[PDB]
Design an enzyme around this catalytic site. Sequence first.
Site, PDB file in Angstrom:
ATOM      1  N   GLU C 103     -15.007 -23.192  16.342  1.00  0.00           N
ATOM      2  CA  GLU C 103     -13.839 -22.298  16.220  1.00  0.00           C
ATOM      3  C   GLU C 103     -12.963 -22.461  17.459  1.00  0.00           C
ATOM      4  O   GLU C 103     -11.767 -22.606  17.316  1.00  0.00           O
ATOM      5  CB  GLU C 103     -14.303 -20.848  16.225  1.00  0.00           C
ATOM      6  CG  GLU C 103     -15.298 -20.540  15.146  1.00  0.00           C
ATOM      7  CD  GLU C 103     -14.746 -20.895  13.789  1.00  0.00           C
ATOM      8  OE1 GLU C 103     -13.606 -21.305  13.706  1.00  0.00           O
ATOM      9  OE2 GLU C 103     -15.451 -20.770  12.802  1.00  0.00           O
ATOM     10  N   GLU C 133      -8.271 -19.650  14.470  1.00  0.00           N
ATOM     11  CA  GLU C 133      -9.438 -20.134  15.190  1.00  0.00           C
ATOM     12  C   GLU C 133      -9.721 -19.284  16.419  1.00  0.00           C
ATOM     13  O   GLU C 133     -10.870 -19.219  16.866  1.00  0.00           O
ATOM     14  CB  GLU C 133      -9.265 -21.605  15.582  1.00  0.00           C
ATOM     15  CG  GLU C 133      -8.885 -22.570  14.450  1.00  0.00           C
ATOM     16  CD  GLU C 133      -9.885 -22.639  13.293  1.00  0.00           C
ATOM     17  OE1 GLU C 133      -9.679 -23.501  12.407  1.00  0.00           O
ATOM     18  OE2 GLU C 133     -10.845 -21.837  13.242  1.00  0.00           O
ATOM     19  N   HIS C 136     -11.706 -16.510  14.795  1.00  0.00           N
ATOM     20  CA  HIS C 136     -13.067 -16.895  14.449  1.00  0.00           C
ATOM     21  C   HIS C 136     -13.959 -17.045  15.674  1.00  0.00           C
ATOM     22  O   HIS C 136     -15.159 -16.751  15.592  1.00  0.00           O
ATOM     23  CB  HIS C 136     -13.044 -18.189  13.634  1.00  0.00           C
ATOM     24  CG  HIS C 136     -12.240 -18.096  12.372  1.00  0.00           C
ATOM     25  ND1 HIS C 136     -11.990 -19.184  11.562  1.00  0.00           N
ATOM     26  CD2 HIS C 136     -11.642 -17.038  11.774  1.00  0.00           C
ATOM     27  CE1 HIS C 136     -11.258 -18.806  10.532  1.00  0.00           C
ATOM     28  NE2 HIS C 136     -11.040 -17.506  10.634  1.00  0.00           N
ATOM     29  N   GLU C 198     -13.778 -28.937   7.837  1.00  0.00           N
ATOM     30  CA  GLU C 198     -13.413 -27.656   7.190  1.00  0.00           C
ATOM     31  C   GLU C 198     -13.481 -27.757   5.667  1.00  0.00           C
ATOM     32  O   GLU C 198     -14.286 -27.066   5.084  1.00  0.00           O
ATOM     33  CB  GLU C 198     -12.031 -27.192   7.657  1.00  0.00           C
ATOM     34  CG  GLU C 198     -11.982 -26.673   9.079  1.00  0.00           C
ATOM     35  CD  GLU C 198     -10.594 -26.580   9.680  1.00  0.00           C
ATOM     36  OE1 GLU C 198      -9.688 -27.184   9.156  1.00  0.00           O
ATOM     37  OE2 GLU C 198     -10.437 -25.912  10.669  1.00  0.00           O
ATOM     38  N   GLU C 232     -10.249 -20.069   6.583  1.00  0.00           N
ATOM     39  CA  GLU C 232     -10.678 -21.494   6.513  1.00  0.00           C
ATOM     40  C   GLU C 232      -9.967 -22.253   5.386  1.00  0.00           C
ATOM     41  O   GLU C 232      -9.657 -23.443   5.590  1.00  0.00           O
ATOM     42  CB  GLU C 232     -12.197 -21.583   6.354  1.00  0.00           C
ATOM     43  CG  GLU C 232     -12.935 -21.739   7.671  1.00  0.00           C
ATOM     44  CD  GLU C 232     -12.137 -22.430   8.763  1.00  0.00           C
ATOM     45  OE1 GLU C 232     -11.636 -21.727   9.663  1.00  0.00           O
ATOM     46  OE2 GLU C 232     -12.016 -23.671   8.710  1.00  0.00           O
ATOM     47  N   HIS C 235      -6.759 -23.669   6.225  1.00  0.00           N
ATOM     48  CA  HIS C 235      -6.967 -24.842   7.114  1.00  0.00           C
ATOM     49  C   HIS C 235      -7.238 -26.071   6.249  1.00  0.00           C
ATOM     50  O   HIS C 235      -6.794 -27.139   6.620  1.00  0.00           O
ATOM     51  CB  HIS C 235      -8.078 -24.574   8.120  1.00  0.00           C
ATOM     52  CG  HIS C 235      -7.883 -23.309   8.871  1.00  0.00           C
ATOM     53  ND1 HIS C 235      -8.845 -22.789   9.678  1.00  0.00           N
ATOM     54  CD2 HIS C 235      -6.843 -22.464   8.931  1.00  0.00           C
ATOM     55  CE1 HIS C 235      -8.410 -21.680  10.208  1.00  0.00           C
ATOM     56  NE2 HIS C 235      -7.199 -21.462   9.768  1.00  0.00           N
TER      57      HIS C 235
HETATM   58 FE   LIG Z   1     -10.653 -23.746  10.563  1.00  0.00          FE
HETATM   59 FE   LIG Z   2     -12.430 -21.383  11.913  1.00  0.00          FE
END
Ligand SMILES: [Fe+2]
Ligand SMILES: [Fe+2]
Lengths: 136, 136, 515, 75, 168, 390, 390
Positions: C103, C133, C136, C198, C232, C235
């Site tokens: 992360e 991130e 996270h 990811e 996520e 991403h």
């Molecule tokens: Fe990510």
């Molecule tokens: Fe992440």
Amino acid sequence: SAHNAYNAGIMQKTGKAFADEFFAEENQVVHESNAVVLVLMKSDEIDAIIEDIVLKGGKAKNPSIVVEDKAGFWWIKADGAIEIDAAEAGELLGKPFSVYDLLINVSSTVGRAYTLGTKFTITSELMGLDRALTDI
Amino acid sequence: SAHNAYNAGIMQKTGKAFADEFFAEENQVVHESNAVVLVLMKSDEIDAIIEDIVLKGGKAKNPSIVVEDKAGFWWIKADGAIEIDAAEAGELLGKPFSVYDLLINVSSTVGRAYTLGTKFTITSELMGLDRALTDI
Amino acid sequence: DALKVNRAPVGVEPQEVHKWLQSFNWDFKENRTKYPTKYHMANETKEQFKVIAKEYARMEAAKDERQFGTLLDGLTRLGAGNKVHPRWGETMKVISNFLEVGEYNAIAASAMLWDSATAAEQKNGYLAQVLDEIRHTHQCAFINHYYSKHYHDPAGHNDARRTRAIGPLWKGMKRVFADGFISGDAVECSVNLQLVGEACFTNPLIVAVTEWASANGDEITPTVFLSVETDELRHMANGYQTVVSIANDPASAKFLNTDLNNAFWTQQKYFTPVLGYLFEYGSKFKVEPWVKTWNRWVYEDWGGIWIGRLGKYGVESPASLRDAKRDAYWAHHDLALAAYAMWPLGFARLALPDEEDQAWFEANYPGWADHYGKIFNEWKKLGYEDPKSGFIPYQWLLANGHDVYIDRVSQVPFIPSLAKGTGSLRVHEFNGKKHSLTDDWGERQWLIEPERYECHNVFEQYEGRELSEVIAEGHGVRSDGKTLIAQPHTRGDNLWTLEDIKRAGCVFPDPLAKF
Amino acid sequence: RQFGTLLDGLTRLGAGNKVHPRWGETMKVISNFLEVGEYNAIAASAMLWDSATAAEQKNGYLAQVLDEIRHTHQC
Amino acid sequence: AKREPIHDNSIRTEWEAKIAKLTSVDQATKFIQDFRLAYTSPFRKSYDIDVDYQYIERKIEEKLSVLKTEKLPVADLITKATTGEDAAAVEATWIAKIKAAKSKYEAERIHIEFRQLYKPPVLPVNVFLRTDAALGTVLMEIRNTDYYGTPLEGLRKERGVKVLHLQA
Amino acid sequence: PQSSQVTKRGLTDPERAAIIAAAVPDHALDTQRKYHYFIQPRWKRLSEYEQLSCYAQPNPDWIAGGLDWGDWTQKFHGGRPSWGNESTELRTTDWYRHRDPARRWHHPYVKDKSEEARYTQRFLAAYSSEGSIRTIDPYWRDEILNKYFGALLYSEYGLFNAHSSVGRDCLSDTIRQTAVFAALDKVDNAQMIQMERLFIAKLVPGFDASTDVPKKIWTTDPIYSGARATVQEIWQGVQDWNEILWAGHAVYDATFGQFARREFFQRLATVYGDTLTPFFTAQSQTYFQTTRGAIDDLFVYCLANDSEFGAHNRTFLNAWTEHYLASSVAALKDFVGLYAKVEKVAGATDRAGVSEALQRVFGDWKIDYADKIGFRVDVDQKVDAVLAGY
Amino acid sequence: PQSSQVTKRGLTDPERAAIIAAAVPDHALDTQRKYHYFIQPRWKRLSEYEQLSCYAQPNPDWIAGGLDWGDWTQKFHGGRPSWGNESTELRTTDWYRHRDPARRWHHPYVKDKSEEARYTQRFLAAYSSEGSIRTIDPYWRDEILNKYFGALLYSEYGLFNAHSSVGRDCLSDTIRQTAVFAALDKVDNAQMIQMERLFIAKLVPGFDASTDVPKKIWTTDPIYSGARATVQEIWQGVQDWNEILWAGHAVYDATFGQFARREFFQRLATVYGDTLTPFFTAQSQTYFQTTRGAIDDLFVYCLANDSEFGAHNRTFLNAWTEHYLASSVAALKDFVGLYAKVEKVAGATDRAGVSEALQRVFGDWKIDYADKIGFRVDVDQKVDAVLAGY
Ligand SMILES: [Fe+2]
Ligand SMILES: [Fe+2]
Ligand SMILES: [Fe+2]
């Protein structure tokens, strides 16, 4: 000490023994109590306050404090008063914590409870009658 | 129908039977899939969307939808695309609900997923390559 | 005028502002990315999630309030933190702190990609990931922070940002989820981070794990990890948009399938055995065979829905897939040998498979009992769990010729004399230094790119030093300063201390001296 | 925090149907009967807010008026 | 060998004593360039202080950087390498070298040597990163062209390793 | 049913819960429950902000402050490390020292911004219902606000993009967080300016909220010529991530930015009956002060007084300041020509008013930044330099 | 241990969970899961706001709309019922018809206000750090703002207290919620004015934030004489809870309140360089429009068009309006004398500007309220009535 337990006194008796004291003529009038009762909702913040404030420096200044586990909440009974400084709890938790954040999980008070500055006080005192309330 | 189940195909075999198909030479290259996979975090809102949108009008327009209970989340696999209109979910829930509120509990997408207006689309289509993205 | 106007209540919705975002960039000749790359990202690329800063915060704060309410109110009141099976509560020491560096570094990787892109919308897509991130990092930290407060063994939950430095499994995590994210061609980093790490591996790592968590009593991790993955997926779109943005670049036909195969092998080299090991050996109750989870999420669904569908645009099935599939079946069992043999270097307490774990392993990996199981049962008979036994299995491997080597590229351990997974030992001397490489894909990377792969390994750093001294120096002890964080059992008595390790006289060798 | 526990955590846990039948029935009565108490206390507290002359005492009653709306909705 | 502790050992204590005796930007520039040529990259002359050189290198950089701010005019800190050369002239020179490269093995050596010689504090940070980024772009384009063409046996000979073991 | 097993929850299934309870020990295995207890606190006790942030970055010991060891596992082609000391001229004994004084980890940051997001929409629905735009001078509205306030979003957008390389290159966790949060606020500012323009397009028919004219003004109007040059330089001319942060926030945005946002557009909104724009500048100005607190801690409190590198660091900070201050002064000299296009209001847009506004911006900057780094500056000389363009 | 048993949780204790699972049926016992499915929705589908609010009030069938039956269990001495039709002159076929268009039950209401609460503190810390008060005209600040804006809190406070009897007497749940939320916003407004005054006392030494002079001005200044009389009448002169609501919000606050807050203090803040006060009037004005939407629904949309009592209700609404409008016009005639104490700014505080501001307030009121109840009003005649005091 043990006079502030949830099951103190008559609460230990069962069956006919309980009824006899429940209906004893001396127990048909209220009996003045110097105690206060405080109920705290269980939560991450509260559980830390209970172990590191109430059960350490709290019981050090007031040895009459009893704390009991009531599954969803903490039942707390003490003689005279209980004080919780939200500024101290904030330092314990590492995050901003006003007296109003403390009140998020203060669930009940049997006693005179009031907010002054960063402090939450529950007291047997008759606030406003025997001792006046103030501003900051 | 059952080709979109979590345990479809080789996933039903055990022991030596699984290994033989896992190491079969035809299974050493990827095989193009028209499917999409959608993961929804379980929550009050999501559980209502699953039963009243996905498993009713969703499966009515796309009979390929399989929904499986994975304890903490819903695993959803379907052919082609899955659409969830946040405006429809808002009417179901009786409370304001934008496409961004829908995304609070949309946990994963194997496919091309995008927000347009009130709608959340996950599609096998190669968005931006075969079909251009637009504004409102 | 000053008396006439329409007074209907209007606001400005997020997608109305997002329409004007592409026009925020302007042209000047210096407006070009600062980072080395073989690709050129098209200036016309659009992003799939129309997010502006204000709505970003509104959406994420609503996720937070619900997550933190469940954790700090409900699950705490329920005492959930100490209702986790010990094996899994230990496993989460590793999973959540190791994921934490992923992360964290993805913050920097996404900022690099934000720099690489020329399209204001693509920049915005990467920018949203940079903020996610950070979210996270704090979420992974919050899990270990929560566990520290409420789980019966806070050690290692409470200090992993320094106690992870002792052991060899951390080094491989740094390749796939730290340096693999930020050191290279921006596009190589992006395929490492977004298209593979990811879009492919966070499904098993973050989504699929929650079912294992729940099976083992852990409702903390689902509450958080499921919220993690909601970001996520945006991403995953970022990674796809990368591909979109370089699709009309003739350099993509030159370069992309090489960067992609390199990133796919990089990620799978570590996550295939490590997740399988953590899932199957770090739990009591198992959900399904790891190779089945890998098949569902990696091979069939990611491979078919991402890679296979991209074949229309010149993306090939990864050449290393065949070798990855052998690792999916066996490499996590191979790693378990190394992880259990070197338990005192970790920061979590482990449990050997019990008799019903072993029957499970054999049923789903026929041949497991005759190879791995015999070894674990022998180690048990020799005192693996018993601190007064003087027995550490790393020395048993050395006594029996089962040397452990560290891949110079991936940092993943390798026991060639026992490994059933992909690989073979290659030892090269170059400019007065020996190097152990373990597979065709990693050896090619080192041979072509030696100056990217100079990572010191644990034998190089610890050579000649006694086990207990390395653990003491690394602070791999509990608050009494004598008891190891790591343990070879999950019981509450008979914990190993530094004196127990020292009695075994385990000194780090140079594995490459014999060559 | 309350709505997070309810709408996220306890729902994911399926808590709503893990109540003993007798008690899940009892809560039909307890929470709806308490609801009228919460509701009427809105009006009672407004009456007391009217009765008081001190701005602070009015404020104390005023805060209760809002709380009893909260509790109606909670029940 | 038997290693000393990781962060505090006699090797690092020894080199910090040598670093303390540097007194001029000129003396420190040659010291850092000698050290980096000697102990960094796969073409280093010596792996003897492998586990310690990166920390020692940091300690050399600190000394040279402080001497830079103590001894050189401000304009110098932005526009010149500590060798005396013009930073922009260094930039132009080494980009021209790498684009003149015939093989990946020529280009790889130019880039590594550029970093060995001109890594900050020798070259100004902004000039250095811009050049290193441009060199890296060229080195990748060459290296990644037909990445899987040469078989490992071939690559091993091209690299010049001594193959000490290949498992059967 | 379904194809795969429906997994029993160890927390609630009787069998598995009974099994787990038999395995959980009856006592704790350690008493240290404070997550990452070894972080040095900046304040009385450890804060959650520090606990969740500090040492997430896995720096080795050869980057000042790191707890790890060894080289990176994978570096750039040629050998550039994942993170390295070659990223910046500045030096310190510990890159983890920095602390955002507002203690923002991710949750409080989006929590605060979400309040502003929702409240802004509520304010806009009521303002449209109030018809309060009726009292806005149409010339200020259509000529200064739409064109010249709109063009300022491009300055904010460039400042935002200057952080891209910062977010990749900078050397610790609290610094990265400080930088990324500053970047988002900047792109927030630009989106909020466009939001205001789009709002007015809904209340005033024929009002063109398109960015075409603002972009044209940003790129070719001499009033923004110097501002655009500085921002293009700060964004794409350098990569020292400390230089970008210091130049962007502590010099440019603190001088040109503060004058443009607060002394021009906010201040003159409250001379021409603009009740809408100050709602938006309230946010940018709040963002500027929150950002200033963290910039101050990093550069003023820490790096400029680092026990071993303070004087070293001030040499670079003083050099950067002379160059970027000279650029920002030019940017302000170009910008004050805008006063030729507005109604002369005594003590506001006459020479006396602009002079005293510049005395506010440059005086505050001297107290906030220059004095604390040892940068000597004649405020008066800078005021008259800017008024040269009035 | 402890004196009482530590209760085993049926959700997680293996024994009790196994027992509960054996008792829970394997099928649902009814399929109707929509809470209070029988509420008539006002919009496409039932909203949570309606589900949690509607029919909480236990009215019997002899109060229009009630679902219960019988007399109350306990009434006042003499027989006044807990709730009764004697509480108001207005009539309707259903007292539950009203719907707040913003659909506020308690949670969204405090959620929104909490955003404003926290953001306001963040804005105040930054404004104090900006030193933006430096550009505030000291006369406007010390004489109009401190004294006359401060005195307006008393008008807001009286409007707030007018709701005390409303909160007790009114006849349905959604109405009660609408009323109570309006009351809190009003006392919020008064506390926010005092908060602004207290803020300035921190930035300007010698600035007296005490309420003494504001209270004295409220109670004895002729500029507030008419406003005070109306508010004292609306608060304590009547108890018809519909009269209070209609008179308080739809007449007084919509005419005097809107002019004082928006046309005077907010509008003239943006002529005298006041960048602080519009942050606070943004809130009051937002509160006014949210409140107006619910008042409109109750009186304009519903009661004035009730299928059986509309014309009946308009008779009282028209009568109330004539009386309270006449009081509010007097209140405004007293109030415009404040313009004798401020600097004459063309189109703002000259006779032309005040005339056109009143044309805004009275014109908007005609469109918002008067036309929709059939109340005939000559705007011009009301403007010249007020300017008579200019
Ligand atoms: Fe990510
Ligand atoms: Fe992440
Ligand atoms: Fe209540």
